[PDB]
C-alpha cells in the first residue's frame, strides 16, 4: 500500500521527478542515466503514479 505521492517522494530523493505527458508516465532527472531498477519500480506503479501526476500538472482538462 504505497500511494503515488510516496513513490514520487522516494524518487525525488535520488534527484528524479515523475510527471505525465502523452497520457503516459515520464521521468525527469539530472543523473547521466537512470538505473533500470528505478525505471522498473516506477513501471510497476506507473498507473498509480499517472493518476496523481495528471493532477500534479493541472493542465488542460474537462473542468
Amino acid at each position: 500500500m504505497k500511494n503515488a505521492a510516496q513513490i514520487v517522494d522516494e524518487a525525488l530523493n535520488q534527484g528524479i521527478t515523475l510527471f505525465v505527458a502523452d497520457n503516459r508516465l515520464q521521468y525527469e532527472t539530472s543523473r547521466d542515466n537512470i538505473p533500470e531498477e528505478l525505471l522498473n519500480e516506477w513501471k510497476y506503479y506507473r498507473q498509480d503514479l499517472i493518476d496523481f501526476l495528471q493532477q500534479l500538472d493541472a493542465k488542460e482538462e474537462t473542468q
Side-chain angles (χ1 to χ4, degrees):
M1 278 301 188
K2 192 183 199 70
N3 45 316
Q6 284 192 72
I7 321 202
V8 178
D9 257 293
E10 277 280 76
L12 166 63
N13 209 330
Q14 321 201 33
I16 175 272
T17 320
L18 296 310
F19 301 128
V20 146
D22 237 51
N23 199 241
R24 90 190 201 157
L25 187 283
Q26 268 107 162
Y27 17 79
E28 201 166 291
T29 185
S30 239
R31 297 169 67 128
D32 294 311
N33 56 277
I34 184 79
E36 46 199 41
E37 37 272 24
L38 272 271
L39 293 189
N40 273 274
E41 262 53 284
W42 307 157
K43 279 170 177 284
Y44 191 41
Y45 287 87
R46 86 281 162 190
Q47 192 56 71
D48 209 89
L49 274 153
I50 291 152
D51 193 54
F52 268 64
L53 300 213
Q54 294 260 346
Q55 318 180 283
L56 247 74
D57 202 55
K59 50 65 182 298
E60 273 269 302
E61 71 192 310
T62 32
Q63 195 189 67

